[PDB]
């Protein structure tokens, strides 16, 4: 139970037999034999009993007797005994009457492995035995059968639709046909950025400041001159030399507070996004305001691309993230949830040290290049929209027809911007972006591109069909043997005809 059990066989060796050959030799060899023929035997026999690892063909048989499957379909015994065709296989066994040490061409060769019915890879023998057990315990539940198929043939791993793992069972119901939860992204100089079908607003008054008076600089200590926004001549991601330099002189803890309509909203998730380029410093800190002192802090390392600091003075912070863009640009996104309506502003500052705050001390003057500020509701960054003293509201698109997949836009897509979609339509799900349109600068209505996989309903009562193979690259021997009905490995309701086949 608890107080040990020893049972060491060698316990029968007193202090007298310290330098003895004999007694010690006999007891050691007896212990080795009892070990090899009891502990090793039971270890490898438990490995036999284990089915996820019934390697030993002996185990696969013991289990096929346990489950009840006829043994005619299994191709156990060691392989490499068929001549057939190829240097990788055996050859004709001839009358080497004098016993040549190569055993003529080969030591033998037979027809063991007759195709179209016989499986040879023991890995799939374990699978088919497990499938028979599932059939033995099955009530017909499609969810259970499919989850067990996934657990067996994929070790409970999610699969993409570019592979097409095991499919449904008897449930004469195709989910879709219409379009639901459709999300469009556009691919452009901003990267892969989604668009909304509902009016979304960016509440910052200015996103590209070309004047000092545009955004004020506030400093509680006011030790040094305020942080001044300078019109910088650098290649902005949109394609202009209109970025703004943001510089902190020595001994200054000032910060820029972008004007924005207040309040923003009580108990609403807030997303701050902006485009930054590494400059004199290497990192920039931002703060989302709230009631004093419930503000949230974050620090973005423009080079390493890590959110090395997320500070919760309250329950504000939810997440922070970075997305990369060409010319070494980064969009830094802060998602914050606060129940108070005191969201007055968002503070921005260059960071001297990698954990510098909005009011950290400045050893010298550090300047960074920023452009395209966007504070919005919701919890996801959206396409940049120019704001000049206006909390700009816009609706990206309207889905005019939800059958053919044609969708119109507020404005035509610029030349080169691509469009990706996700969701479900035509009885097929696209959990990954799928391109369907390229902008030409004159057209705003575009038709969606086909998603995945099979029309799906498989019209018919009381009966359905399996689908498998492009993912697992399974053997046609497996496909045919499982397609056989008599052996009864597939789970089956009494009174439902299911053919396995498929790919």
């Amino acid at each position: 139970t608890l107080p040990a059990y020893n049972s060491d066989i060698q316990q029968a060796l007193k202090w007298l037999h310290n330098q003895a050959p004999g007694i010690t030799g006999l007891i050691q060899r007896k212990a080795q034999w009892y070990d090899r023929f009891s502990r090793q035997f039971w270890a490898n026999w438990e490995r036999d009993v284990f089915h996820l690892k019934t390697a030993n063909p002996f185990g696969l048989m013991v289990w096929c007797i346990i489950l009840g499957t006829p043994s005619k379909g299994f191709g156990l015994y060691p392989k490499n005994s068929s001549w057939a065709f190829g240097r990788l296989r055996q050859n004709f066994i001839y009358s080497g009457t004098q016993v040549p040490p190569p055993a003529d061409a080969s030591p033998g060769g037979n027809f063991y492995g007759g195709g179209n019915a016989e499986i040879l890879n023991l890995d799939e023998i374990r699978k088919v035995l497990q499938l028979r057990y599932v059939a033995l315990i099955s009530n017909g539940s499609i969810a259970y059968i499919n989850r067990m198929l996934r657990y067996i043939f994929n070790d409970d791993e999610p699969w993409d639709e570019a592979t097409g793992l095991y499919f449904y069972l008897m449930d004469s119901t195709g989910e879709n046909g219409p379009v639901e939860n459709l999300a469009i992204y556009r691919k452009d100089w901003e990267g892969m950025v989604l668009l909304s079908s509902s009016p979304r607003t960016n509440h910052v008054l200015t996103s590209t400041p070309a004047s000092d008076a545009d955004w004020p600089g506030v400093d509680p200590a006011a030790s040094g001159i305020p942080v001044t926004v300078e019109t910088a001549s650098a290649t902005a991601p949109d394609g202009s030399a209109t970025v703004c330099k943001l510089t902190k002189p020595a001994g200054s803890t000032a910060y820029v507070s972008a004007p924005i309509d207040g309040p923003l909203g009580s108990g609403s998730t807030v997303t701050f996004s902006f485009f930054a380029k590494a400059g004199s410093t290497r990192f920039i800190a931002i703060q989302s305001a709230a009631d004093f002192p419930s503000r949230a802090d974050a620090v973005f390392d423009l080079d390493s691309g890590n959110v090395i600091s997320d500070q919760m003075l309250d329950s504000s912070v939810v997440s922070a993230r970075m997305i990369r863009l060409e010319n070494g640009w980064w969009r830094c996104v802060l998602t914050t949830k606060t129940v108070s309506s005191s969201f007055r502003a968002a503070y921005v500052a260059p960071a001297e040290t990698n954990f510098s705050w909005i009011d950290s001390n400045s050893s010298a003057a550090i300047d960074v290049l920023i452009w395209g500020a966007q504070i919005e509701l919701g919890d996801t960054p959206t396409g940049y929209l120019e704001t000049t003293g206006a909390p700009v509201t816009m609706t990206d698109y309207v889905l005019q027809n939800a059958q053919t997949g044609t969708v119109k836009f507020t404005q035509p897509l610029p030349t080169g911007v691509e469009a990706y979609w996700t969701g479900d339509w035509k009885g097929g799900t696209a959990a990954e972006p799928a391109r369907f349109a390229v902008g030409n600068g004159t057209q705003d209505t575009f038709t969606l591109s086909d998603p995945a996989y099979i029309g799906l309903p498989t019209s018919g009562a009381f009966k359905l069909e399996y689908r498998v193979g492009p993912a697992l690259n399974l053997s046609p021997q497996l496909i045919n043997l499982m397609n056989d009905r008599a052996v009864g490995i597939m789970p089956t309701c009494a009174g439902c005809d299911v053919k396995v086949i498929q790919e």
Binding site: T1, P3, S7
Partner: protein, 106 residues
């Protein structure tokens, strides 16, 4: 529902008249587990029954109808805590059927 007195020893044999039958359980420490040899009315019913908590001792229906009863451990068997901490309970036919009904829907 009758509590069977136990003694904190590794190997023991308890014989008693319970449920209109003459039961005798020999409980012994086998390696890191406990096993029980159960004999009813002299004729031995089972050997080497590994003992667990809540799990019935006479595991097979032939050993417990018509309303012969069963023995249940509250916890995993451990002779160090026998008497004080781990008790073995005997159920007659009706109580054991009710226990089966409760334990088969969990």
């Amino acid at each position: 529902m009758k509590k069977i007195p136990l003694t904190a020893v590794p190997n023991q044999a308890i014989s008693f008249n319970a449920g209109s039958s003459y039961w005798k359980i020999r409980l012994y420490q086998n390696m890191d587990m406990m096993n029980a040899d159960i004999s009813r009315d002299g004729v031995i019913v089972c050997h080497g029954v590994r003992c667990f908590g809540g799990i019935p001792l006479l595991q097979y229906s032939r050993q417990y109808r018509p309303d012969y009863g069963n023995f249940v451990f509250d916890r995993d068997a451990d002779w160090t805590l026998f008497g004080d901490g781990i008790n073995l309970f005997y159920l007659d036919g009706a109580e054991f059927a009710e226990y089966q009904a409760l334990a088969t829907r969990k």
